[PDB]
Amino acid sequence: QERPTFYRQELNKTIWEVPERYQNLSPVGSGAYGSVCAAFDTKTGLRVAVKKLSKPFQSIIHAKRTYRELRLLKHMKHENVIGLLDVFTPARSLEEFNDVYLVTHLMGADLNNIVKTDDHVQFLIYQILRGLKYIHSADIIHRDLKPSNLAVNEDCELKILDFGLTDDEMTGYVATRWYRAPEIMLNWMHYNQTVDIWSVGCIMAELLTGRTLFPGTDHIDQLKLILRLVGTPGAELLKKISSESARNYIQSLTQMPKMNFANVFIGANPLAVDLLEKMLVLDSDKRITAAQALAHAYFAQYHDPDDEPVADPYDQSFESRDLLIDEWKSLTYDEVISFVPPP
Ligand SMILES: Cn1c(=O)c(Oc2ccc(F)cc2F)cc2cnc(NC3CCOCC3)nc21
């Protein structure tokens, strides 16, 4: 990190100050907690996405999430997971440290601007599960997996964005909620990493049919659509719903049996139907895991147990830690300073 020369440019109505190596900066749009620009990295020859974080140390919540995102991106080193090519600040010291810029691969499209074959579905879902196995192996949950954070290149090579990171944007007929596990949508319980597997199920179904699986007009309508497909919960699951209020509402609903998935997904590969049945289980305890799903017959042509790596241990003790703004800021600066680019 032998200090490069920085230059200034106005882009997303703020001034961006970036090393000379990054040229031809052009806005892509909004990212998680900041705006994103496309650029050409003259050092590596890669087309890159550069995210400038907005007000990264404005509050404790902002400072902690800035540290969180940096920690997450620095840890992730997997073909199917967004990772960090570079991180920089124009600041020369902790004292003047105010801005954080994050750099990753520029991707061609997301899964939204791709669909509306079974072999393509196989490859796409395989890579999502491969990436999820890695993320989950580090005790990280995505929590908000959806087509818009699944980015793909021209060769259909896929990377997962925005892992591990309001009510109004969750309201109504919105894609922001359509892929959410019911237990997290309705805050039933302390949830596990198979919330992400529910999301994969929804995504896979949509790739297969060209249609949203559970296009609910609101939380309640969406629950009804879900329960019509998978059945109303039994006593066993009801017990696990620790929210007495949520549990009480569920029991008010007329009981419905699980539907026949072969009659729902007409003409689909029987192995795809089988996998969907194992992913779209209401009881999260009983959902197929990413590692288990990779071994399912549906992915026979792609599955390789020696080419599906797990992550190094990820220390997130910081998550249960209470610190001041300047403390989170200092930790973040340390991580910026210690960054080593990938080979
Ligand atoms: C929307 N978006 C991000 O939010 C994003 O976040 C970052 C994460 C970590 C970093 F170090 C830096 C980041 F910029 C990266 C990103 C890459 N490629 C693309 N391609 C678009 C995908 C949708 O179709 C148009 C091209 N979009 C992206």
Side-chain angles (χ1 to χ4, degrees):
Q1 55 148 357
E2 284 82 298
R3 208 195 176 270
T5 298
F6 287 69
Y7 76 103
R8 289 154 79 95
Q9 187 180 182
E10 201 198 49
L11 282 151
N12 290 302
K13 277 57 198 268
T14 69
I15 71 99
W16 286 51
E17 186 159 7
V18 308
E20 294 182 296
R21 69 186 280 181
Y22 303 114
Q23 293 292 319
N24 312 133
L25 273 80
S26 189
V28 169
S30 59
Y33 319 122
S35 55
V36 181
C37 281
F40 180 71
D41 178 14
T42 55
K43 160 70 195 166
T44 59
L46 293 163
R47 290 193 67 181
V48 295
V50 183
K51 189 166 74 174
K52 187 192 178 186
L53 296 179
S54 36
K55 306 261 203 161
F57 313 107
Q58 194 174 32
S59 64
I60 297 170
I61 292 171
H62 281 238
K64 192 173 181 170
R65 80 179 192 197
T66 297
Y67 182 70
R68 176 182 302 115
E69 175 165 30
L70 184 52
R71 285 289 312 279
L72 287 163
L73 293 169
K74 283 187 72 176
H75 194 78
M76 302 285 93
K77 290 166 188 182
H78 188 281
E79 294 176 336
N80 303 120
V81 179
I82 285 294
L84 204 60
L85 292 170
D86 196 18
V87 52
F88 59 83
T89 182
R92 301 176 174 271
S93 72
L94 173 62
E95 285 64 43
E96 56 179 48
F97 181 49
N98 292 308
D99 287 306
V100 178
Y101 294 77
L102 305 158
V103 184
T104 194
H105 302 271
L106 180 71
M107 302 303 292
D110 61 37
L111 278 190
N112 276 143
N113 21 107
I114 273 185
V115 290
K116 172 176 276 201
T117 74
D118 189 55
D119 264 58
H120 296 128
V121 175
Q122 281 180 39
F123 185 47
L124 284 173
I125 303 305
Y126 171 76
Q127 295 176 86
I128 296 168
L129 290 166
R130 192 173 174 252
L132 283 181
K133 183 197 180 190
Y134 180 88
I135 291 161
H136 289 170
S137 74
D139 254 290
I140 301 159
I141 308 169
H142 194 297
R143 287 179 185 90
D144 194 33
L145 203 63
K146 51 192 181 167
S148 62
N149 52 41
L150 297 165
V152 189
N153 80 12
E154 303 72 52
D155 297 312
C156 279
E157 295 171 312
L158 176 148
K159 293 188 197 301
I160 302 164
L161 285 61
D162 293 345
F163 46 90
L165 306 172
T166 82
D167 295 328
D168 188 75
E169 36 223 294
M170 287 293 163
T171 307
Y173 189 73
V174 289
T176 57
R177 203 193 54 251
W178 293 335
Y179 307 88
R180 307 266 284 175
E183 69 267 17
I184 183 160
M185 181 178 70
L186 296 163
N187 303 299
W188 284 352
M189 59 188 80
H190 191 238
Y191 52 86
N192 61 43
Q193 51 198 217
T194 60
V195 291
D196 292 336
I197 295 301
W198 183 271
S199 304
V200 178
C202 298
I203 291 159
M204 175 164 165
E206 184 166 343
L207 294 182
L208 291 167
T209 64
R211 308 288 165 198
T212 317
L213 186 55
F214 308 117
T217 55
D218 54 78
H219 291 60
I220 301 302
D221 183 61
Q222 195 170 320
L223 176 68
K224 289 179 188 173
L225 296 178
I226 289 168
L227 300 183
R228 183 168 140 263
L229 181 66
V230 308
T232 42
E236 193 185 338
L237 180 52
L238 286 173
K239 249 197 258 66
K240 308 181 195 181
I241 299 158
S242 49
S243 179
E244 192 189 321
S245 194
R247 195 201 298 116
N248 175 251
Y249 172 66
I250 294 151
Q251 299 190 263
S252 76
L253 305 177
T254 304
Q255 297 188 78
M256 295 173 293
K258 181 190 164 297
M259 284 177 78
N260 186 327
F261 276 45
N263 286 327
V264 173
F265 302 104
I266 301 154
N269 187 340
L271 293 179
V273 177
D274 185 71
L275 184 63
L276 285 165
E277 290 190 318
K278 295 183 184 317
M279 294 184 295
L280 296 164
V281 173
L282 203 63
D283 188 344
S284 73
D285 278 349
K286 294 180 184 176
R287 256 171 242 157
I288 197 162
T289 69
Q292 290 154 8
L294 290 164
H296 190 278
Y298 189 55
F299 307 114
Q301 66 167 126
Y302 297 106
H303 175 49
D304 178 357
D306 297 312
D307 195 26
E308 289 158 5
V310 297
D312 289 353
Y314 173 69
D315 190 329
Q316 57 184 130
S317 61
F318 80 89
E319 289 288 2
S320 53
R321 203 179 299 146
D322 285 330
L323 298 174
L324 303 170
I325 291 170
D326 285 347
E327 284 164 335
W328 288 121
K329 179 168 159 170
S330 179
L331 288 178
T332 302
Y333 188 71
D334 284 345
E335 293 285 343
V336 172
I337 292 313
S338 62
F339 179 78
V340 177

